[PDB]
DNA sequence: CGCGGTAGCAGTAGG
DNA sequence: GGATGACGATT
DNA sequence: CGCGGTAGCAGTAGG
DNA sequence: GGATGACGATT
């Protein structure tokens, strides 16, 4: 909801402010927690946007 | 009372009492009808 | 900021739009005037006639009925012909040098 | 996609009132008009810059 | 739904006896049971009902027993006074007699607890033979009316009661169970099970968001809705009378649901559909009670009683409509959902088609590049006598083309409408056209020459 | 314009509600059209959509007709008892299709 | 030759 | 007072 | 991201 | 026995 709720724009501003370079999903885990997927991969997309 | 509940009427009396099945409703009716307009010489 | 085009009265019951607010495209005002000319399912027609005479500039020649002239005077010429646009500097975001 | 890039170029070139105060590229062709906000513009194989 | 062949007259005289038993529930609310026994082998039909029966008493004016009066003589009914607003089915005083008249044998049997007597009288040969009633003492027993008749099949052109007429009669008994409130109906000693009009409407479930949308609007109105397959369908009941052809009541309901839907479809998006397209995707079930109803004929298939005389109103709620909009009917309507407005790109010459239609010139352009150039040219040559339209691409070769392929090509059609063009006769003068001149703007390349060729062709 | 309309006459009787005769005519024109629309291209439309775009005028003479009531607004006489048949030609249908 | 769909934000306009 | 749409680089 | 329209010829297949 | 469609470079 932090990611896809139109109502949360500012929340996402701060969310991007928080992210730390080098924070990426583990290449070899074979188990992806959704929260991590949002804080380790999708956020990359947003940044790129 | 049982003689006032059940009535027998003549054919002439049924027509004037319940015209609908003979000539149609005797009440005014809102309708969409075709008419001849003498001014334009056509149906409308 | 507010941004105004230019509407002028060039005759009895005749207006002329020579300029629109920047970024306000000609086709928008065109559709608007066409709607005002041929009326609509939800709104009654308020424009008697409309012609386009655009050179390297905007020309709209509009003819209203006197009633619509008074009414438009009550509404405001620029306010009714969509000749006012807001500019907001409140959202100026960019990547700093770093 | 090269499409998006072509559009970026066209955007850099447009010279109708209300577009670029200083167009860094020259609109050698139908680079759109004020009539639709540059949307009229012609296809890339048409215009030059 | 099964294709059948029946004699409507036969089915009707059977309906006249049923509707009479259902009327008796309105008369005496304490009624509980209705029996319908069809002996096909003996071509005999029996309709029995408890509750208050027929008064066994000499009519003070007609000088004969009341049963003999109201079952043996035409034009005899208790529904002749309209001062009292009644919700019975009986209106004209024919249906008992109409069954008797069509029957080789007709027998009335009733028990009156007021006089403590039992009454049995038999008619024969189309109500031409009237046997004196056998009256006996009837003590410590329930009051009831039992009508048994043997249809004059020879008149109906039948040698027996075949599966088709039987299957229909039986379903007319299920109708009664559903349309009448607080009774128990039995078909040859077998309970019909259903208890209310909803139970009834659900019998059509397997044939037909749910599949059936039922509600009770008020003490006199019950409405159910389902999406129809082929066209509009209706199953209505006015006082337990199967109004198979509909009438004022059906329309009263449908005219609402169609009206409200149209506004909703239209309001949300442009182009909302014609009324008939909405109506013909509905199945409407109606069970209502109209005060002193009026019909087209004695058969009472079509109600004509104006809405304002219903003796009650049925306002279809918005909640109901929003549920109908949750069924396929909605996604169905979404599927269907001088100047020229038909063509946006078109820069129509100010004078085009007008008294100067012959002067003005329409400029066709190869591509939006050429188009842009032309519209730019308007700013030099004036709009009054010059327009322009962009040809999409290589034009359609009209010769060796089906009329349908030409009709389908939006590009040629657009041209024909902008220029005000028709094939009729041979063109003598431009005078009939929106434009009097046509100008071709092609890039000046070979393909352009081809375009010119296709235009000329 | 809006929906199916009919103006029929059975022996100079204004059958305003229609009946077996009207349906006898419409059931043909709708049937033949559907085949033509369906045959040429796939997806041909439901019967009601064809019928409700027609205006049908009918002037016919039925032998010993039968109606719903004395008012005679609706004919019920089965087609096979008409005392005559009306076969709508293909030429007629191809003109409706124009 | 040309048409169409979707994300993402801030503010304006339309009912 | 909630909804729809414009703008633009990209799928 | 994706979909659609038209010319022009020879021969095959579908009702 | 006439109609529709495939193929391909170009709008
Ligand atoms: N099983 C019954 N119990 C009580 N009353 C009855 C019964 N059957 C018939 N009647 C009465 O007998 C009269 C004549 O019946 P009928 O010929 O069917 O006239 P109707 O039902 O009132 N009018 P209609 O329904 O149009 O034929 C009616 O007024 C009834 O009230
Ligand atoms: Mg009856």
> Among the atoms of ligand 1, which is closest to the Cα of residue E98?
17
Strands E33-39, E184-187: parallel, antiparallel or unpaired by DSSP? parallel
- Nearest residue to B18 via CA among E79, F80, E408: E79
In which element (H, E) is residue E230 found? none
- Nearest residue to E363 via CA among E350, E351, E379, E374: E374
Cβ–ligand 1 contact at E211 (below 6 Å)? no
Neighbours of chain B (3+ CB pairs under 8 A): E, F
* Nearest neighbour of E80 by CB, restricted to B7, B11, B27: B7
Whole-angstrom CA distances from E314 to D43, E294, E324 are 61, 18, 17
Any strand H atom closer than 7 Å to D4 CB? yes
Please give the Cα distance from F3 to E255 (Å, whole number).
14
> From its phi and psi, is residue E382 left (phi > 0), alpha (psi between -120 and 50) or beta?
left
Sequence-distant (6+) residues with CB within 8 A of C29 are C17, C20, C60, C81, C82
Interface check D21 vs C, CB under 8 A: no
Chain D residues whose CB is inside 8 A of the C25 CB are: 34-37
Chain B residues whose CB is inside 8 A of the F70 CB are: 21-23
The reply to whether E93 sits in an annotated binding site is yes
Chain E residues whose CB is inside 8 A of the D47 CB are: 369
- Nearest residue to E14 via CA among E6, E4, E24: E6
The reply to whether E297 sits in an annotated binding site is no
> From its phi and psi, is residue E374 left (phi > 0), alpha (psi between -120 and 50) or beta?
alpha
User: Phi, psi (5° rounding) for residue F14?
Assistant: -80, 100
Q: What is the DSSP string of E82-138?
A: -SS----S--SS-HHHHHHHTEEEEEEEEEETTTTEEEEEEEETTTTEEPPPEEEE-
Which residues lie across from C62 on neighbouring strands?
C15, C50
Please give the Cα distance from E346 to E368 (Å, whole number).
12
CB-neighbour burial class of residue E331 (10 A; exposed 0-12, middle 13-18, buried 19+) = exposed
Residue B17: CB atoms within 10 Å: 12
Please give the Cα distance from E318 to E257 (Å, whole number).
9
F82-97: b (≥16 Cβ within 10 Å) or e: beeeeebeeeebeeee
Which residues of F belong to the annotated binding site? 70-72
Please give the Cα distance from E271 to E249 (Å, whole number).
29
3-class secondary structure, E362: strand
CA atoms within 13 A on the CB side of C11: 7
Sequence-distant (6+) residues with CB within 8 A of B7 are E76, E77, E78, E80, E81
Whole-angstrom CA distances from C31 to C38, C96, E28, E377 are 10, 41, 70, 21
- Nearest residue to A3 via CA among E226, A44, E444: A44
Q: How far is the CA of E75 from the centre of ligand 2 (A)?
A: 11
Which residues lie across from E437 on neighbouring strands?
E361
In which element (H, E) is residue E81 found? none
Chain D residues whose CB is inside 8 A of the C23 CB are: 18, 37
Q: How far is the CA of E323 from the centre of ligand 1 (A)?
A: 41
Whole-angstrom CA distances from E403 to C24, C71, E396, E412, F35 are 44, 52, 12, 12, 18
A24-34: b (≥16 Cβ within 10 Å) or e: eeeeeeeeeee
Residue C16 in contact with residue C59, Cβ under 8 Å?
yes
Catalytic annotation present for D48:
no
Residue-level length of chain D: 49
Angle at E107 between CA E103 and CA E112, to 5 degrees: 150
**Residue to substitute from E229, E277, E335, interface F, most F β-carbons within 10 A:** E277
Please give the Cα distance from E440 to E123 (Å, whole number).
93
Residue E97 in contact with residue E76, Cβ under 8 Å?
yes
* Resolution limit, Å: 4.4
3-class secondary structure, E219: coil
CB-neighbour burial class of residue D11 (10 A; exposed 0-12, middle 13-18, buried 19+) = middle
Please give the Cα distance from C43 to C50 (Å, whole number).
18
3-class secondary structure, E170: helix
Q: How far is the CA of E146 from the centre of ligand 2 (A)?
A: 14
- Nearest residue to E27 via CA among E77, E67, E66: E77
3-class secondary structure, E434: coil
Residue-level length of chain E: 457
In which element (H, E) is residue E9 found? helix E8-27
Q: Which two tokens stand for residue B30?
A: 């809102």
- Nearest residue to E42 via CA among E121, E131, E149: E149
Q: Which two tokens stand for residue E152?
A: 């004059």
Please give the Cα distance from E213 to E195 (Å, whole number).
18
Q: How far is the CA of E22 from the centre of ligand 1 (A)?
A: 10
Please give the Cα distance from E195 to E201 (Å, whole number).
11
Single out the catalytic residue among D46, D47, D48, D49: D46
**Residue to substitute from F16, F66, F69, interface E, most E β-carbons within 10 A:** F69
Please give the Cα distance from E440 to E144 (Å, whole number).
93
Q: Which two tokens stand for residue D5?
A: 């890039």
Residue C58: CB atoms within 10 Å: 20
Which residues lie across from F56 on neighbouring strands?
F6
Q: Which two tokens stand for residue E303?
A: 């109600």
E182 alpha-carbon distance from chain centroid = 28
Q: What is the DSSP string of E373-421?
A: HHHHHHHHH-STTEEEEEE-SSPP--TT--HHHHHH-HHHHHHHHHTT-
CB C27 to CB D17 under 8 A?
no
Q: What is the DSSP letter of E347?
A: B
Please give the Cα distance from F82 to F29 (Å, whole number).
19
Taking a 5 Å cut-off on Cβ, the residues next to ion ligand 2 are E 19-20, 90, 95
Please give the Cα distance from C89 to C87 (Å, whole number).
7
- Nearest residue to D21 via CA among C94, C5, C23: C23
Q: What is the DSSP string of E293-344?
A: --BSSTT--EE---GGGSSS-----HHHHHHHTTSHHHHHHHHH-----S-T
Any strand H atom closer than 7 Å to D11 CB? yes
Whole-angstrom CA distances from E196 to E189, E200, E214, E313 are 20, 7, 12, 21
3-class secondary structure, F36: helix
Q: Which two tokens stand for residue E138?
A: 């009837």
User: Phi, psi (5° rounding) for residue C70?
Assistant: -60, -50
Strand J, nucleotides < 7 Å from a protein CB: these are: 3-4, 10-11
């Amino acid at each position: 909801d932090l990611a896809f709720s139109k109502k949360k724009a500012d929340d996402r501003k701060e969310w991007l402010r928080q992210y730390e370079p080098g924070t990426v999903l583990d290449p070899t885990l074979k188990e992806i927690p959704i929260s991590d997927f949002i804080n380790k991969e999708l956020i990359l997309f947003s940044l790129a946007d | 009372s049982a003689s006032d509940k059940y009535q027998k009427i003549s054919q002439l009396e049924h027509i004037l009492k319940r015209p609908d099945t003979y000539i149609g409703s005797v009440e005014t009716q809102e309708q969409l009808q075709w008419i001849y307009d003498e001014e334009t010489d056509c149906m409308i | 900021y507010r941004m105004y085009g230019r509407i002028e009265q060039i005759g009895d019951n005749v207006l002329e739009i020579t300029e629109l607010p920047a970024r306000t495209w000609t086709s928008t005002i065109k559709e608007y005037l066409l709607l005002g000319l041929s009326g609509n399912d939800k709104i009654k027609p308020w424009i008697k006639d409309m012609e386009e005479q655009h050179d390297d500039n905007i020309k709209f020649i509009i003819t209203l009925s006197p009633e619509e002239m008074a009414k438009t005077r009550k509404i405001g010429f620029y306010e009714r012909f969509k000749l006012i646009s807001p500019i907001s500097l409140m959202n100026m975001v960019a990547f700093d040098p770093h | 996609g090269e499409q998006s890039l072509a559009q970026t170029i066209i955007g850099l070139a447009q010279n109708f009132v209300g577009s670029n105060n200083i167009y860094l590229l020259l609109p050698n062709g139908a680079f759109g008009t004020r009539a639709t906000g540059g949307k009229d513009a012609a296809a890339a194989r048409y215009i030059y810059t | 739904e099964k294709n059948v062949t029946i004699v409507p007259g036969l089915f009707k005289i059977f309906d006249e006896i049923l509707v009479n038993a259902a009327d008796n529930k309105v008369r005496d609310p304490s009624m509980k049971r209705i029996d319908v026994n069809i002996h096909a082998e003996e071509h005999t039909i029996e309709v029995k009902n408890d509750g208050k029966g027929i008064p066994i008493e000499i009519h003070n004016k007609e000088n004969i027993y009341i049963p003999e009066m109201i079952f043996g003589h035409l034009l005899t009914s208790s529904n002749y006074d309209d001062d009292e607003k009644k919700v019975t089915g009986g209106r004209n005083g024919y249906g008992a007699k109409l069954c008797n008249i069509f029957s080789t044998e007709f027998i009335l049997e009733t028990a009156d607890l007021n006089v403590g007597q039992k009454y049995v009288q038999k008619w024969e040969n189309n109500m031409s033979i009237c046997h004196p009633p056998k009256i006996t003492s009837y003590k410590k027993g329930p009051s009831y009316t039992k009508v048994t008749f043997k249809p004059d099949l020879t008149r109906f052109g039948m040698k027996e009661l075949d599966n088709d007429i039987l299957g229909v009669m039986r379903r007319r008994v299920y109708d009664i169970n559903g349309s009448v409130r607080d009774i128990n109906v039995y078909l040859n000693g077998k309970s019909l099970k259903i208890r209310n009009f909803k139970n009834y409407v659900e019998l059509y479930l397997k044939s037909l968001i749910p599949t059936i949308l039922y509600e009770r609007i008020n003490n006199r109105w019950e409405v159910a809705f389902a999406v129809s397959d082929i066209s509009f369908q209706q199953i209505s009941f006015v006082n337990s009378i199967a109004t198979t052809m509909g009438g004022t009541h059906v329309n009263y309901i449908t005219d609402q649901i169609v009206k409200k839907i149209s506004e909703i479809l239209k309001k949300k998006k442009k182009k909302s559909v014609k009324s008939f397209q909405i109506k013909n995707n509905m199945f409407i079930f109606i069970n209502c009670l109209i005060e002193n109803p009026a019909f087209t004929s004695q058969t009472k298939e079509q109600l004509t009683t104006r809405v304002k005389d219903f003796g009650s109103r049925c306002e279809i709620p918005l909640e109901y409509i929003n549920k109908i909009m949750k069924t396929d009917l909605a996604t169905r309507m979404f599927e269907i959902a001088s100047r020229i407005t038909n063509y946006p790109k078109l820069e129509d010459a100010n004078k085009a088609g007008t008294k100067e239609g012959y002067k003005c010139t329409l400029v066709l352009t190869e591509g939006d590049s050429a188009l842009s150039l032309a519209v730019a040219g308007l700013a030099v040559v004036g709009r009054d006598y010059y327009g322009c339209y962009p040809l999409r691409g290589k034009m359609l070769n009209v010769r060796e083309a089906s009329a349908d392929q030409i009709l389908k090509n939006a590009e040629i059609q657009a041209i024909k409408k902008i220029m005000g063009l028709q094939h009729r006769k041979k063109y003598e003068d431009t005078k009939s056209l929106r434009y009097g001149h046509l100008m071709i703007m092609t890039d000046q390349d070979h393909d352009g020459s081809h375009i010119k060729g296709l235009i000329i062709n």
